[PDB]
Amino acid sequence: YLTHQQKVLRLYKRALRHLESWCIHRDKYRYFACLLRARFDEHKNEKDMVKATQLLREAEEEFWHGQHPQPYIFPESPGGTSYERYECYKVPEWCLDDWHPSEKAMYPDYFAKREQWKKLRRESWEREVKQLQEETPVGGPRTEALPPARKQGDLPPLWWHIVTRPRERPM
Amino acid sequence: MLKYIIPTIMLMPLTWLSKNNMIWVNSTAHSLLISFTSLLLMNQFGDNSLNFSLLFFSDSLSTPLLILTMWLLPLMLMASQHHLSKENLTRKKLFITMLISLQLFLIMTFTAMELILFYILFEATLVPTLIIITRWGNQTERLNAGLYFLFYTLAGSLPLLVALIYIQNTVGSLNFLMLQYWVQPVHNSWSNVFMWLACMMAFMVKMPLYGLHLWLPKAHVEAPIAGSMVLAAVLLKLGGYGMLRITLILNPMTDFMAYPFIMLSLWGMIMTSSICLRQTDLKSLIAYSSVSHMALVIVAILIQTPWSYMGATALMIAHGLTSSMLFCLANSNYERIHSRTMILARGLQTLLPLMATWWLLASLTNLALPPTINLIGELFVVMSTFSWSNITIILMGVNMVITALYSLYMLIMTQRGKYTYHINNISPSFTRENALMSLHILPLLLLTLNPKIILGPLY
Amino acid sequence: SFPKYEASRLSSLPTTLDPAEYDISSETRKAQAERLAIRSRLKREYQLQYYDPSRRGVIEDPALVRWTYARSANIYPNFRPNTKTSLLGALFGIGPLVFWYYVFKTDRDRKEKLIQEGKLDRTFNISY
Amino acid sequence: DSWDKDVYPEPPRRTPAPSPQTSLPNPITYLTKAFDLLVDRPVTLVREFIERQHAKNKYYYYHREFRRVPDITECQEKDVLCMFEAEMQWRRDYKVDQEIVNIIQERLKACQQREGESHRQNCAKELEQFTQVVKAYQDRYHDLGAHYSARKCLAKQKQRMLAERKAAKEAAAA
Amino acid sequence: SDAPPLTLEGIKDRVLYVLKLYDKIDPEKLSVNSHFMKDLGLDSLDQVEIIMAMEDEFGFEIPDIDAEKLMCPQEIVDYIADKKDVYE
Amino acid sequence: LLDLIWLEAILPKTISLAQMKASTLVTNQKGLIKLYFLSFLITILISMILFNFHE
Amino acid sequence: MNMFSSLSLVTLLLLTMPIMMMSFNTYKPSNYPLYVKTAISYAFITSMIPTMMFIH
Amino acid sequence: DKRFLKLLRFYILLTGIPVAIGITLINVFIGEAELAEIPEGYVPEHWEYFKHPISRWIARTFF
Amino acid sequence: LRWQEDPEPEDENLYEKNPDSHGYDKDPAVDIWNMRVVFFFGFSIVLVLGSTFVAYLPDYRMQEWARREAERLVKYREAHGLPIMESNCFDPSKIQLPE
Numbered sequence A: 001y002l003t004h005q006q007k008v009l010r011l012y013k014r015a016l017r018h019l020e021s022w023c024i025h026r027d028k029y030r031y032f033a034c035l036l037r038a039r040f041d042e043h044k045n046e047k048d049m050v051k052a053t054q055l056l057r058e059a060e061e062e063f064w065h066g067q068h069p070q071p072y073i074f075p076e077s078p079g080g081t082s083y084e085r086y087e088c089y090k091v092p093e094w095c096l097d098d099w100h101p102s103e104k105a106m107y108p109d110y111f112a113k114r115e116q117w118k119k120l121r122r123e124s125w126e127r128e129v130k131q132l133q134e135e136t137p138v139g140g141p142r143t144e145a146l147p148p149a150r151k152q153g154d155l156p157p158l159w160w161h162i163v164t165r166p167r168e169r170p171m
Numbered sequence B: 001m002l003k004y005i006i007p008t009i010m011l012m013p014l015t016w017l018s019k020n021n022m023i024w025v026n027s028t029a030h031s032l033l034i035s036f037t038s039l040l041l042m043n044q045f046g047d048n049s050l051n052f053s054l055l056f057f058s059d060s061l062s063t064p065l066l067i068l069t070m071w072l073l074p075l076m077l078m079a080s081q082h083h084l085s086k087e088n089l090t091r092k093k094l095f096i097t098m099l100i101s102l103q104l105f106l107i108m109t110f111t112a113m114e115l116i117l118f119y120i121l122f123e124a125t126l127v128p129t130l131i132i133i134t135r136w137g138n139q140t141e142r143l144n145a146g147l148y149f150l151f152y153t154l155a156g157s158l159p160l161l162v163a164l165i166y167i168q169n170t171v172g173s174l175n176f177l178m179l180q181y182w183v184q185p186v187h188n189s190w191s192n193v194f195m196w197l198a199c200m201m202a203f204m205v206k207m208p209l210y211g212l213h214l215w216l217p218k219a220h221v222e223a224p225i226a227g228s229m230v231l232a233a234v235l236l237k238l239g240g241y242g243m244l245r246i247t248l249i250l251n252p253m254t255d256f257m258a259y260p261f262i263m264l265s266l267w268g269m270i271m272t273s274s275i276c277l278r279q280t281d282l283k284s285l286i287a288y289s290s291v292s293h294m295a296l297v298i299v300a301i302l303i304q305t306p307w308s309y310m311g312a313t314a315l316m317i318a319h320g321l322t323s324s325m326l327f328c329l330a331n332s333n334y335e336r337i338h339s340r341t342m343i344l345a346r347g348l349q350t351l352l353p354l355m356a357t358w359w360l361l362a363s364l365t366n367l368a369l370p371p372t373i374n375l376i377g378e379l380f381v382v383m384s385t386f387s388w389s390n391i392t393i394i395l396m397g398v399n400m401v402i403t404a405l406y407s408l409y410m411l412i413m414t415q416r417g418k419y420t421y422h423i424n425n426i427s428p429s430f431t432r433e434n435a436l437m438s439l440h441i442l443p444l445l446l447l448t449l450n451p452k453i454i455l456g457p458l459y
Numbered sequence C: 001s002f003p004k005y006e007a008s009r010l011s012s013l014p015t016t017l018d019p020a021e022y023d024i025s026s027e028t029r030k031a032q033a034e035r036l037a038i039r040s041r042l043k044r045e046y047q048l049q050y051y052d053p054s055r056r057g058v059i060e061d062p063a064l065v066r067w068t069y070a071r072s073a074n075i076y077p078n079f080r081p082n083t084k085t086s087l088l089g090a091l092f093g094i095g096p097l098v099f100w101y102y103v104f105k106t107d108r109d110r111k112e113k114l115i116q117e118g119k120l121d122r123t124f125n126i127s128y
Numbered sequence D: 001d002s003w004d005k006d007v008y009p010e011p012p013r014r015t016p017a018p019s020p021q022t023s024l025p026n027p028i029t030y031l032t033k034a035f036d037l038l039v040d041r042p043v044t045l046v047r048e049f050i051e052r053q054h055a056k057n058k059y060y061y062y063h064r065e066f067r068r069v070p071d072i073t074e075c076q077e078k079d080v081l082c083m084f085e086a087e088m089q090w091r092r093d094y095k096v097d098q099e100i101v102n103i104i105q106e107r108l109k110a111c112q113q114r115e116g117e118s119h120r121q122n123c124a125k126e127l128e129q130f131t132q133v134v135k136a137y138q139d140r141y142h143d144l145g146a147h148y149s150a151r152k153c154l155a156k157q158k159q160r161m162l163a164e165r166k167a168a169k170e171a172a173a174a
Numbered sequence E: 001s002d003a004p005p006l007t008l009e010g011i012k013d014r015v016l017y018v019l020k021l022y023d024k025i026d027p028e029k030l031s032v033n034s035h036f037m038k039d040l041g042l043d044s045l046d047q048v049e050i051i052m053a054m055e056d057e058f059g060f061e062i063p064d065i066d067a068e069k070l071m072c073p074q075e076i077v078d079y080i081a082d083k084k085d086v087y088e
Numbered sequence F: 001l002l003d004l005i006w007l008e009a010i011l012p013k014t015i016s017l018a019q020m021k022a023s024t025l026v027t028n029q030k031g032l033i034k035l036y037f038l039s040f041l042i043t044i045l046i047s048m049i050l051f052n053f054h055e
Numbered sequence G: 001m002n003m004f005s006s007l008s009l010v011t012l013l014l015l016t017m018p019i020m021m022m023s024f025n026t027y028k029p030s031n032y033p034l035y036v037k038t039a040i041s042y043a044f045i046t047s048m049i050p051t052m053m054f055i056h
Numbered sequence H: 001d002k003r004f005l006k007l008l009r010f011y012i013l014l015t016g017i018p019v020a021i022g023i024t025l026i027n028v029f030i031g032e033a034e035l036a037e038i039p040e041g042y043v044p045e046h047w048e049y050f051k052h053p054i055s056r057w058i059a060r061t062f063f
Numbered sequence I: 001l002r003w004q005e006d007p008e009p010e011d012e013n014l015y016e017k018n019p020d021s022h023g024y025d026k027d028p029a030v031d032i033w034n035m036r037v038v039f040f041f042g043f044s045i046v047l048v049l050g051s052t053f054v055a056y057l058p059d060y061r062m063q064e065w066a067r068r069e070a071e072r073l074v075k076y077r078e079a080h081g082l083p084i085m086e087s088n089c090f091d092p093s094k095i096q097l098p099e
């Protein structure tokens, strides 16, 4: 979940982004950008949590009433005009295992070095499993954060599919 | 028909006497020569049909069905090579024998001149089909599927046996040629109402008709690949062939007895097409699409117009090659991911480029994209049903909209999108699979150039 | 001033306007922390197979199998012929069939009557 | 030459002569010459070469003729041998009449395109011949059903003759 | 897409260039490791505006889960490098 | 509602259920000679009193 | 008419030529985008000859 | 995928080209027949009521 | 355990032992010959030659004859002033109405 601090910062980022859409021009955005900041300062250091949550609750409703119906969205952000555009070009690395030997003859250096990564992953798997069994509580993990490599020569647990992922512009 | 019956029988000695490593090659090579020689049945005349002997005759209706029937035996043997690779030698040869037997009973059924002979062979197809479903299925539901496929057919078939024998005692013969000249109008009475039901219920359980179709989503889904192909390609068309023949001696009673079945079929298209939009199993989606397509055949046959009979014949041939193609495509995924759920493997166009072209072509023919013979057959039925009643255009039109939805929903869900990350055994497509699909679509697209050879006797 | 938001089955209540989010008590904290435990526990079981270098196949998901089973094979054994099902099963199954029968019977009777009287135009109708 | 003119009539052509009233050259006139030299002439040479080979190995094919046999009206009930030949003859005549409706329809479709904006008045004769042949075809072949036969066509004719005969009785009633 | 590829030095220069143009940051003590909270006397509201100026610089959003976890210009440089496949 | 519940419950299931019930009655027999032969007597009487098979 | 008819069909058949050559692979890649453009460009001039005959 | 398309192309053209070449020659150096009235007292065979040579060959040999 | 049963045999990948596999069989010799029979009879014979045979069928169901016959009758009918098509298919000189 989100503490009271986070729920206020997130409301602050959204308000400026939707405020930017209404203003369009850069000079006019700066004007109301400062006024919006001021309203967040005069209550910056309120002490009563109940009043603090009251202000946040009554600010969201104002935000909802005044939100732009069609806010600006970055091209590659969720809902943008370029979101997931290149998911059709992202092929996983295991697809190269099935290449015909004739094809691999055209990339000897690449497939001479690809085998080194495969050997590295294969040798380091057994240790990674141990690093998690001993460092995890009796029942099971209570969070999704993995532990780093606590020794030299050992790679972080669960690194293959976060390191070898397809590039954001595969082609 | 001895030039086709006897060679089919010789496929049995060939399979058993061949080497251990050449059963699939000898069976597939000679099953393609029998298919090649089946084109000689195309010697049809505008006035008269071919009447080889007292037993067997072939006309413009049975000829295309024979050619399709003799063209699936090679394809069924190609599709079955993989999932029977680690199988005992003798059981593989018994499996091939069952398919050969099924063809033999099928090329004698479509040519039997005497209706009771047509009945014996029409029923003989249950035995090999039942054994294929129950012995070489993969799931637990294959045993419960055979009973449904067996007792639904027999429930309506036995009443047909009594009705046929009654007709011979009255008329004096069952030879189909004689019944063209000795047929008499059916007087309207409670006795003739039940002779109409008995003479037509056996065939309407095999189409299948909506309401009586519960056996099909089980048998097609739970059968092996070869069983599904013949079940949906040639065995659903025994009902169509029978009705096109038995309706000769049921006039004029068919003019008012057809109402309950037309409404079931017209309203069954929409119910079954809608069911496809919410199917989690990919092989079950294809099965429910056969019930929706075969409901147009039922309406075309029951209204008895020259256009409808032409449309029904084309639809049966077109649906035979399209349903079979879809079953093979789905099985290709099954042999890799070992599951039938449609949402398990996605984004297969980025992993199997050329296999996504077959999916597109199969889907386009399914939704009747012109000028494919699917559209020609489906179009002729709508033209005839419009003259029957202008209001049927609403129901036919809505079924076209829903048909495109599930045809493309199947394509988008499985081929497009993002691939499943954890599935890393999707190997490149084999030459067997690519050739297997190419022997479905190519004949299906070549028939558009000369459609008259699949348009039936009324052409 | 600010009209109240009225949700629907096609327009869910925004999380920022949800009263249940602001009322944070100890019991919810343990619940929210407990849900993250199952989610984190499930993730590790999936990850110990996803990252396995010798694994080549499909990681069977029991959650998916239960979904398909509940939709196909678990319907009838958990069905009872009560009033809600019998009425729904009648007006959805038999209702439409009866409605369409009279729509076609009435239309064909009217058309047949005209043709006998010769007052239905079929001047160029030779295709049927 | 390749088709009898009587069955497929063609009104005489009337091509207006060019009457230029400008100095600018007509591009079509140059293209017409450039097309004849580059396209028409080389095509003709090939056709002449092929047609010479045909004349060396000429052979003929004939048009089958069917002599008349007794129709269904002369056949005893339940006599398969006599009905069979009477039925086959009827089916051969059904096809011929279908092509007649095509030939007349082709005339009506050719006239409309040929006459341009004046088709409404200049194709009156073609339209009338189409409205009569269609009526004749409809009477003898409409509503028989998918299982049409000589017996049902005869059954339809006799019913109509009864209505026509019964029309006289109530028509010559005064 | 015909655009020039990014570089670690190029990313770092642009990250600092924006900070040098923030009034509440004195350029004299601005360094690639200057903590925004503990080494520059800035609060979270200002830190949010920093991210809102970085994403408008490179034209890609930073989710609020990760935006509120970067507390130094070098970290922002690493974040962009990870999300753009910049390696040398 | 239709394909998985009612169409199954108005033909396959109900017909199948009746045959299961009819099989239990015919087969659930105590095996006693005294009670099988007492049934022969009832058949002979009914055949003569009701159905008059003896004339 | 010998020209109006011929040039009217060649316009349609010309557009289908790149499709046919890309099925039997009787061509070369890396120039196909420039191959399709030329076919459309040449199809435009051939279609004006029938159009001029209509205006005249 | 490329290999399969090469095989499909090869085998279709393996007998496709001779058929195209064969059909072209038959239409050039043999050609079709000419419709003529039946000579009096002459009974044509069943394969002399067809125009194209290949149609006549099919009727004579198989049908 | 409840019985002695073999473990599930992991699916065999046909490309590991033969990257040139056509997918028909594990034996390279049999596999190549299986592809040639299917591709030759399937495509080079049944389809290519089957299409040619169908293309040149001898006047399927006498449709070219019917058109040719109708030309003769229309020429005769209009030349002699008779109706192009009659509304009675059978000569009424040989019909006896019920009463």
Ligand SMILES: [Zn+2]
Residues within 6 Å of the ligand: B334, B335, B336, B338, I011
């Ligand atoms: Zn498998």
